[PDB]
Amino acid sequence: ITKDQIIEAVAAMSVMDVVELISAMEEKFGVSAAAAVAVAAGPVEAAEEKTEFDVILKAAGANKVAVIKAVRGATGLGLKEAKDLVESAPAALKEGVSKDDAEALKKALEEAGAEVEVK
Amino acid sequence: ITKDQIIEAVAAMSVMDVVELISAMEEKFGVSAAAAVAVAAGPVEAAEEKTEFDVILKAAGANKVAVIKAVRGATGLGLKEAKDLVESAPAALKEGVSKDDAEALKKALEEAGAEVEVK
């Protein structure tokens, strides 16, 4: 399949497949020619959702405006952008930070009265 | 399309992709009716390894070194790394991203004067 379908096929996978895939990306030709996909598949967000940890907004609760403030301060988005990212709860509040940052972001959000998860 | 073909299709599909599906099914049928495919889609083994597209490099253009830099920071790969992964257009940039990600990865490369596709 086109390389622009395999790279994705991977992303689709989960800890199970990625491991089954990497465990299906080795011996055939040793860990040598396997390190390529191994070191590439390793950086799978999960173990870093540093160790890409993001923040998901399960719900804002009754304190919507409160949750908005936290978002407008973390992401820096406008009033309309923030509320739009909290109402429908598009999850992805911000990704790329570290475990400490995300753990902190989640904390700040929870304080506002919002339920957050860490994939 | 044959049920078996659909199963194989989904296996070839991806997260955000099947998400656009389960979301479309959720918007079309509902959280109740689309619950069947939703609880069946997620198990793309599951826990989510994480997230779907790809970031193939159709051509680095005249700014090879420019495209290299972007790849070096995205894939964490060193200098000589992006070298080939950009010249021969090996395509395989980084597997394990979603829309906001792959779309951004594409943008980042396009800015460096590189033609990238998203399939």
Next chain:
Amino acid sequence: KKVQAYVKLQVAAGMANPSPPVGPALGQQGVNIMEFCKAFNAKTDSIEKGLPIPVVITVYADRSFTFVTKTPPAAVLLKKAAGIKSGSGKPNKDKVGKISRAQLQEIAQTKAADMTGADIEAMTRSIEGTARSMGLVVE
């Protein structure tokens, strides 16, 4: 304005002409060897006369050129750490000089601007390989 080149190697502070070596090279790319010489041995007059510093120079956009004397330490002091003048024709068989552990980290760090290696222990194990293949002993 679109016509531009770039390339330059190490040059002894004070030497330039005649043509060989620095003659046809960087002489048919746009810049002449006529000047550029006094624009070299006039800017590098306050350091060590025997310091082959690789100054970086572009080429031109009109006719002229450019000059940027950078920074030896490195390469130098390493040859002057175990007899630079008198060296062993066939290194590995014998020695020429000696260096302590202190003067092993000294030349180190003072060149990291060219050696991109994490940790200092990795920095030590680089000039220890480049340590010698032309005289001098490890310890």
Next chain:
RNA sequence: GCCCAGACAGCCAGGAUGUUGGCUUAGAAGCAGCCAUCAUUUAAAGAAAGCGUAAUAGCUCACUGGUCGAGUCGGCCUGC
């Protein structure tokens, strides 16, 4: 011995940095010869196995990635 957890060979692109390594040599800067043959960035790249230059340059190989997706490679013996 290497083989369908994408290699061994094709095709595409790399094959680098100190360094024109030291010595010698009219000159030899991977590639007359004489001794070493480490280190660097790092997916790979021997201070370099060949062609080539007066000396450079240039062109390949080793090694690695993508693609190609299948029989391939070194070797011993016997018949005409």
